[model samples]
Target: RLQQNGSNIINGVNMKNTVIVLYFFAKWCQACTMQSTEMDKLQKYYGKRIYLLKVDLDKNESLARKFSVKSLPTIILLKNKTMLARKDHFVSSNDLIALIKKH
Candidate 1:
């Protein structure tokens, strides 16, 4: 499992050769509420190739604010502590995977 920090947006990340994908979602979010299972399945499929950091939007308020997360189910891809790409809405497993692949 990966370490999770709710204070700072990013305490640390793999940042070796793979991309870090952060998923910001909350239970009350309709999109996340419905896609929770699907997202889990996607995480399982991706495995460890990409660092999947699941952040509870409600619990990680500070972290979410640091990331400027304005919506639920935001996906941000990072490489070497820099933002590579980001999706600001609910996304499918394939789309997220493809974005990670692109970066």
Candidate 2:
């Protein structure tokens, strides 16, 4: 359900009081692979408080384009589909947790 593409899924975020966190990655990207474990820990730490999603930048080009995602591991934190923060590359758990707390 998380990997679905199209405007419906993209627009769906508008109706929720949720933080939409999307990680754009590719199978062949070295950094994406390296960041997998960190993303996993994020899932464990945040639990159900946030809506976490992982999009394949290579396969899901439309979704990537919608967000103007130009790099690997683009993390978008949104509130009611409005962007709160967008980060790329590696981030520590504490820093990420703090950011999410702000939203």
Candidate 3:
């Protein structure tokens, strides 16, 4: 059965049925500040369909290297632990929704 914004999904790190949006950003970048709001809209729009997580490179040096984050704001979509795409710079909720629906 398909659940609509109901209790369906957890695990601190992985969930097989959900899409993980890895939002990687650092304070050093000038444009990342703008990307924050872009993501906020994506957050509210998707809500539970997508598992939103913040990859803090400040203390997340390992993850920083893992994704080889070169852009100012990098958005990595995942199924469980597998990556779908690496989207960079500022993006919109509509744009994100498109990628997620493919899974």
Candidate 4:
């Protein structure tokens, strides 16, 4: 399950049963700000089918480093602790949904 304060995923959890979406963002980044606006709707649309975790780049330094997120507004889709896909910058809700479905 996802944490509230941008915390790390729990060890020994059944990650294979769930899809995880890691959204790496910076508050000062314009693209992040834009994406933030639609995040709620995206989360709601996905519901429990997937995990949408928002990681604040400014706060979660270690996570940023771990993911090798060099750019702002990085979106990573993972399953069973494996990276399936990643994208940076603008991504539409429909495209995001499609991407998640693909993985």
Residue 29 CA error for candidate 4 (Å)?
Answer: 1.4
Candidate 2 minimal-lDDT segment of 10 residues: 6-15
Q: Could you tell me every candidate's TM-score relative to the true structure?
A: 0.76, 0.79, 0.76, 0.80
Give per-residue lDDT, candidate 3, residue 7.
28
lDDT of 4 by residue, 1-103 (tens): 5664422444225333577888899888998888877677678898988888898889989888987888988988887777788897768778788988886
Candidate 1 root-mean-square deviation in Å: 5.0
User: Who is ahead in lDDT, 1 or 4?
Assistant: 4
Deviating ranges (above 4 Å) for candidate 2: 1-10, 13-15
Q: Residue 44 in candidate 4 has what lDDT?
A: 87
Clashing pairs in 4: none
Tens-place lDDT per residue, model 2, 6-36, is: 4423545323566667778899998888677
Query: Candidate 3 lDDT, tens digit per residue, 1-103?
Result: 5543422233232224688788888887667778878778888888887878877677787878877987768898877556788787777767887877788
Ranking by lDDT: 4, 2, 3, 1
Model 4 vs truth, CA RMSD? 5.1
Candidate 3 segments exceeding 4 Å error: 1-11, 14-16
Per-residue CA lDDT of candidate 1, range 42-81, in tens?
A: 7788788777778997797999999899988788887666
List clashing residue pairs in candidate 3: none
| Model 3 residue 88 distance off true place after TM-score fit, in angstroms | 2.7
lDDT of 4 at 97: 86
lDDT of each: 0.75, 0.76, 0.75, 0.79
